[PDB]
Amino acid sequence: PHTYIKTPTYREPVSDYQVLREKAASQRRDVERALTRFMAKTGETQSLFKDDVSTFPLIAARPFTIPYLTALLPSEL
Amino acid sequence: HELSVEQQLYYKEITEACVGSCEAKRAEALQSIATDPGLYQMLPRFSTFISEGVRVNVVQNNLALLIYLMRMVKALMDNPTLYLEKYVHELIPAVMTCIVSRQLCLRPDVDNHWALRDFAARLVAQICKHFSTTTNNIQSRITKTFTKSWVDEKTPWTTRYGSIAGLAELGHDVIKTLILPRLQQEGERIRSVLDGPVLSNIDRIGADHVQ
Amino acid sequence: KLKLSNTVLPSESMKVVAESMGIAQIQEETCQLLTDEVSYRIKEIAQDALKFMHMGKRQKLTTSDIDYALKLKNVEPLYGFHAQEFIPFRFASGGGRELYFYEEKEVDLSDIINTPLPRVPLDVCLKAHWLSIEGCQPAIPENPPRLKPRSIHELSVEQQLYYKEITEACVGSCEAKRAEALQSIATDPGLYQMLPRFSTFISEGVRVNVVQNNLALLIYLMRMVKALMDNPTLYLEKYVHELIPAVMTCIVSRQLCLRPDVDNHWALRDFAARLVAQICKHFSTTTNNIQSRITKTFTKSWVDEKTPWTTRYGSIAGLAELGHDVIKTLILPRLQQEGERIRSVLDGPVLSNIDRIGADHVQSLLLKHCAPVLAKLRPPPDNQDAYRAEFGSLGPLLCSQVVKARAQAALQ
Amino acid sequence: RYGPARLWYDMLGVPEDDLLADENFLMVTQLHWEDDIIWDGEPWYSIFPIDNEDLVYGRWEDNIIWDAQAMPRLLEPPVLTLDPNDENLIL
């Protein structure tokens, strides 16, 4: 049934809503964790615990000159 | 298909941290790229950024930005979570361009293009150790480009240096069956070293580096 | 452009024939008259014997074509003799004379009687097969040979199902299934373009199959390697860099499963591995890459002090099956070390380990190789106690093995 | 211009929008396969994975820039193609 005839095959598609929700959720959580750890490590940092930069680093609070512009204005529109 | 704002901001900060404002933010960005779990969905953007940035060396022969892009590739390879098998066809000619191109410098005489040569040669030996499969034929096709760039005359001493550097970082049997037949070429090199009519040219430093 | 000429037989051969017959003092124009007449008759017959070649649908002029071309020109096909009366043999071909240029021109009349007659070949039979199935030629042995689009695997699903069936048959659950699958590997013409997946299945299998020393899994994989090698269609030396470290591991490795009992098979696992190893050094050979590399690894396996004796026995077998000269040049300066190892296993009481079994197998194999190595390069004189100059390992029993080899040579 | 590599585009300021014999290269003659030998160690959908067609088939060697000034052909900006064959990408 293989000497003279050939038909193509494809890769296994994952159309499952559960695992797609899990993949998108975990990728969003991982990229936002990586972004916040990178921004807390390359700037001024605070800490809830004494000398705690590796675990739970906080980006330090900087004052704005005009705070209503960064508060009230929408960024995605 | 379009990156969410979170990862769009992460892509912007990580790429602008590796352009050269300071070294510490660069080291933390490379330690981010090497050690994060979820950087897929941003691998094609990084591959496009790296390959186009190595292409932009032809308009501006910046050695420093090429060293930064090669350290970006070396950081991308050390990530255990992301698999570069689908995007290696873009990163192979970028590292190859950093190896076998002839002008890697803005001032050819003082810039150590030589290190971006052996660093990228070690990088391509790693990229064809981890990814060469008999369906791929990565290593045989890389050795063939290096070999026909080395055996062929008219090639500059910089690109011959890159060819010899990559071939010698591949391993011991490669230098047994590629380098050792053309050891007589050293005589053709020492033709222009021990006795050159023009001494103050730039061929002598490249020739004794090759030597 | 055609520079066609008219080549005739030389006239200086025609005067030799004439003066060896009684016709002396012939002129050159008389002699040139002979060599254009007979060179025409050779050209007339060879053009007429080419008619029988084309009619018989052959491209080679056989010896019988000139027998029918002569009979067509009313000349007797007899070459050795000519019968004036013509009645004993009338235009009957005697098949020519089996004569040579480099012949002996004298034989003994009982040499022709005592030689065995050649085998009459098989009679003509009619087998049918398929050149074309609805336009496509099958690969049977009777035949000669922006989002990027979702890609397809380079194997068909009939090919992928074939690969799955052949691999699940080659792990040897049933023996008839194995044997067909092995013959299918041995003669499938279209087994290229599936060969990376077979080489990867072999290589990966042995390495995770020596984690627990599963002998059948290994004996089946070695038979799969042997079935891959004798297939004539596929190109193997692109994949031999995965094939060779798999077989070296079968030969030079320790056995994680029960040490004794299947050691008999273990010797065969090392027997099948050393067979395919020297077959791989026979093929695929270029300068100083494959054979010398496995020879160097076998020798540094041997000269290594205080080896595992399973590894020792396997490496001994591997260096043993390398041919005529290899044991002639390598096993020579090492007999004393082999004897000392045997003496240590003998002295230490420890019997529940595998050291004693390994020692006995190694000594027997080394003694058989030394026997012909001796039968091959010296006469069989003083076969009683001269071998005591070589520590007295095989001695008279080695001499008896040499005598058995001599008897086999006499039978040949 | 606005896609990945926009930073490079902005920095540039562009605004539109016998030793070559086949055997030498066979990996039996170029690989220390001795290291592999293990000594004293201690289908309706595809069964096998699908390889990068561009790496397996394309001539990526044509994107190597051998000489910056003397470049045999003219290269063009590359658009992001987001291959969906790769898993780990949501779309």
Query: What is the 3-class SS of C43-109, one letter each residue?
Result: HHHHHHHHHHHHHCCCCCCCCCHHHHHHHHCCCCCCCCCCCCCCCCCCCCCCCCCCCCCCCCCCCCC
Q: Where are the alpha helices (DSSP H) in A1-77?
A: 17-41, 67-72
- Cβ(C107)–Cβ(C100) below 8 Å: no
Q: How many CB atoms are located within 10 Å of the residue C318 CB?
A: 25
As a whole number of angstroms, the distance between CA D5 and CA B57 comes to 13
As a whole number of angstroms, the distance between CA B158 and CA B162 comes to 6
- Cβ(C273)–Cβ(C250) below 8 Å: yes
Distances (CA, A) of C263 to B186, C247, C267, C317: 55, 17, 6, 14
As a whole number of angstroms, the distance between CA C133 and CA D21 comes to 39
As a whole number of angstroms, the distance between CA C60 and CA C68 comes to 15
Q: Helix or strand or coil: residue C136?
A: strand
Mark C144-178 as b/e (b = at least 16 C-beta within 10 Å). eeeeeeebbbbbbbbbbbbbeebbebbebeeeebb
As a whole number of angstroms, the distance between CA C95 and CA B70 comes to 81
The pair of three-digit structure tokens given for residue B128, joined into one six-digit string: 């064809």
The 3 state secondary structure assigned to chain D is CCCCCHHHHHHHCCCCCCCCCHHHHCCCCCCCHHHHCCCCCCCCCCCCCCCCHHHHCCCHHHHCCCCCCCCCCCCCCCCCCCCCCCCCCCC
User: Considering only CA atoms, which of C281, C354, C353, C275 is closest in space to residue C313?
Assistant: C354
Least CB–CB distance from A32: residue in B6, B24, B37: B6
The position carrying tokens 């088939």 is D57
| B117 contacts: CB under 8 Å, gap ≥ 6 | B98, B99, B104, B158, B161, B162, B165
Quick check: B134 and C238 CB within 8 A? yes
Please return the burial class of C132, using the count of CB atoms within 10 Å of its CB with bins 0-12, 13-18 and 19+: exposed
Kindly report the length of chain A.
77
As a whole number of angstroms, the distance between CA A32 and CA A13 comes to 27
Q: How many CB atoms are located within 10 Å of the residue B173 CB?
A: 18
The position carrying tokens 């330090």 is A60
Q: This structure's resolution (angstroms)? A: 9.8
As a whole number of angstroms, the distance between CA C37 and CA C202 comes to 72
What angle do helix axes C65-72 and C28-55 make, rounded to 10 degrees? 110
Distances (CA, A) of A53 to A58, B34, B35: 8, 19, 17
As a whole number of angstroms, the distance between CA D36 and CA C249 comes to 9
Q: How far is C191 from chain A (nearest CA, A)?
A: 10
The position carrying tokens 């990068």 is D52
- Cβ(A34)–Cβ(C178) below 8 Å: no
Quick check: D46 and A10 CB within 8 A? yes
Where residue C57 falls (left for φ over 0; alpha for ψ -120 to 50; beta otherwise) is left
The pair of three-digit structure tokens given for residue B122, joined into one six-digit string: 């070690």
As a whole number of angstroms, the distance between CA C395 and CA B93 comes to 67
Mark D34-50 as b/e (b = at least 16 C-beta within 10 Å). eebbbeeeebeebbbeb
- Cβ(A4)–Cβ(C133) below 8 Å: yes
**Phi–psi pair at C246, nearest 5 degrees:** -70, -45
Residues 180-239 of C with CB under 8 A from A: 190
What angle do helix axes B113-127 and B88-100 make, rounded to 10 degrees? 150
**Which chain A residues touch C162 with a CB distance below 8 Å?**
2
User: Considering only CA atoms, which of C278, C281, C319, C322 is closest in space to residue C302?
Assistant: C319
Chains in contact with chain B (at least 3 beta-carbon pairs closer than 8 A) = A, C, D
Quick check: B134 and C289 CB within 8 A? no
As a whole number of angstroms, the distance between CA B186 and CA C154 comes to 46
As a whole number of angstroms, the distance between CA C175 and CA C177 comes to 5
As a whole number of angstroms, the distance between CA B114 and CA B100 comes to 11
User: Considering only CA atoms, which of B89, B56, B45 is closest in space to residue D77?
Assistant: B56
As a whole number of angstroms, the distance between CA A41 and CA C153 comes to 45
- Cβ(C163)–Cβ(C151) below 8 Å: no
**Phi–psi pair at B21, nearest 5 degrees:** -75, -50
As a whole number of angstroms, the distance between CA C306 and CA C278 comes to 26
Residues 74-133 of C with CB under 8 A from A: 133
Beta-carbon-side half-sphere exposure of residue B167 (alpha carbons within 13 Å): 28
The pair of three-digit structure tokens given for residue B153, joined into one six-digit string: 């005359």
**Phi–psi pair at B124, nearest 5 degrees:** -80, -25
Residue of A nearest to D49 (CA): A11
Q: Helix or strand or coil: residue A7?
A: coil
Quick check: D29 and C289 CB within 8 A? yes
As a whole number of angstroms, the distance between CA C215 and CA C250 comes to 9
Mark C25-45 as b/e (b = at least 16 C-beta within 10 Å). eeeeeebeebbeeeeeeeeeb
**Which chain C residues touch D34 with a CB distance below 8 Å?**
245, 248, 293, 297
| C67 contacts: CB under 8 Å, gap ≥ 6 | C77, C93, C95, C96
**Which chain D residues touch B53 with a CB distance below 8 Å?**
5, 8
As a whole number of angstroms, the distance between CA C59 and CA C81 comes to 30
**Phi–psi pair at C159, nearest 5 degrees:** -70, -40
As a whole number of angstroms, the distance between CA C89 and CA C176 comes to 60
Virtual torsion, Cα C275, C280, C282, C287, nearest 10 deg = -140
Quick check: C147 and D83 CB within 8 A? yes
User: Considering only CA atoms, which of B29, B173, A18 is closest in space to residue C241?
Assistant: B173
Distances (CA, A) of D21 to B143, B181, D30: 12, 13, 13
Beta-carbon-side half-sphere exposure of residue C201 (alpha carbons within 13 Å): 21
Residue A58 β-bridge partners: A46
- Cβ(C244)–Cβ(C280) below 8 Å: yes
Kindly report the length of chain D.
91
Residue C133 β-bridge partners: C136
Kindly report the length of chain C.
412
As a whole number of angstroms, the distance between CA C370 and CA C395 comes to 11
Least CB–CB distance from D39: residue in C242, C244, C253: C253
**Which chain C residues touch B47 with a CB distance below 8 Å?**
none
What angle do helix axes C395-411 and C355-376 make, rounded to 10 degrees? 50
Distances (CA, A) of C20 to C51, C83, C232: 36, 21, 57
As a whole number of angstroms, the distance between CA C10 and CA C404 comes to 59
- Cβ(B7)–Cβ(B41) below 8 Å: yes
Q: Helix or strand or coil: residue C340?
A: helix
Sign, CA torsion C234/C237/C242/C247 = positive
Mode of pairing for the β-strands spanning A58-59 and A45-46: antiparallel
Please give the single-letter amino acid code of residue C151: S
User: Considering only CA atoms, which of A65, A69, A47 is closest in space to residue A57?
Assistant: A47
**Which chain B residues touch C238 with a CB distance below 8 Å?**
134
As a whole number of angstroms, the distance between CA A55 and CA A37 comes to 9
The pair of three-digit structure tokens given for residue B182, joined into one six-digit string: 């053309």
C162: enclosing H helix or E strand: helix C157-169
Distances (CA, A) of C279 to C75, C90, C100, C248: 56, 58, 38, 13
Can you name the CATH fold of C11-73?
Histone, subunit A (1.10.20)
Please give the single-letter amino acid code of residue A71: A
| C389 contacts: CB under 8 Å, gap ≥ 6 | none
Sign, CA torsion A52/A53/A55/A59 = positive
Mark C271-310 as b/e (b = at least 16 C-beta within 10 Å). bbbbbbbbbbbeebeeeebbbebbbebbeebbeeeebbbb
Please give the single-letter amino acid code of residue C182: L
- Cβ(C368)–Cβ(C319) below 8 Å: no
As a whole number of angstroms, the distance between CA C119 and CA C108 comes to 23
Q: How many CB atoms are located within 10 Å of the residue C18 CB?
A: 16
A45: enclosing H helix or E strand: strand A45-46
- Cβ(C374)–Cβ(C335) below 8 Å: no
Q: Tell me the Cα Rg of chain B.
A: 19
As a whole number of angstroms, the distance between CA C144 and CA C138 comes to 10
- Cβ(B192)–Cβ(B207) below 8 Å: yes
Quick check: A34 and B9 CB within 8 A? no
Is A32 at the interface with chain B, CB within 8 A?
A: yes
Residue C136 β-bridge partners: C133
As a whole number of angstroms, the distance between CA B127 and CA B89 comes to 11
**Which chain A residues touch D84 with a CB distance below 8 Å?**
none
Quick check: B13 and A32 CB within 8 A? no
Mark B14-26 as b/e (b = at least 16 C-beta within 10 Å). bbebbbeeeeebb
As a whole number of angstroms, the distance between CA D33 and CA C290 comes to 10
Q: Where are the alpha helices (DSSP H) in C188-262?
A: 195-208, 215-229, 240-252
Q: Where are the alpha helices (DSSP H) in C253-378?
A: 263-282, 291-302, 309-320, 324-329, 335-347, 355-376
Virtual torsion, Cα C165, C166, C168, C170, nearest 10 deg = 160
Q: How many CB atoms are located within 10 Å of the residue C215 CB?
A: 18
The pair of three-digit structure tokens given for residue B60, joined into one six-digit string: 């501006």
As a whole number of angstroms, the distance between CA B72 and CA B27 comes to 10
User: Considering only CA atoms, which of C280, C334, C345, C272 is closest in space to residue C306?
Assistant: C345
Distances (CA, A) of C299 to A34, C241, C276: 54, 20, 18
User: Considering only CA atoms, which of B95, B47, B7 is closest in space to residue D79?
Assistant: B47
Q: How far is A8 from chain D (nearest CA, A)?
A: 9
The 3 state secondary structure assigned to chain B is CCCCHHHHHHHHHHHHHCCCCCHHHHHHHHHHHHCCCCCCCCHHHHHHHHHHHHHCCCCCCCHHHHHHHHHHHHHHHCCCCCCCCCCHHHHHHHHHHHHHCCCCCCCCCCCCHHHHHHHHHHHHHHHCCCCCCCCCCHHHHHHHHHHHHHCCCCCCHHHHHHHHHHHHHHCHHHHHHHHHHHHHHHHHHHCCCCCCCCCCCCHHHHHHHHC
Beta-carbon-side half-sphere exposure of residue C287 (alpha carbons within 13 Å): 5
A58: enclosing H helix or E strand: strand A58-59
Q: How many CB atoms are located within 10 Å of the residue C109 CB?
A: 6
The position carrying tokens 């037949």 is B181
Quick check: A10 and C152 CB within 8 A? yes
As a whole number of angstroms, the distance between CA C406 and CA D29 comes to 42
The pair of three-digit structure tokens given for residue C164, joined into one six-digit string: 């799955």
The position carrying tokens 């040949």 is C412
The pair of three-digit structure tokens given for residue B2, joined into one six-digit string: 């379009």
**Which chain C residues touch D37 with a CB distance below 8 Å?**
245, 248-249, 252, 297
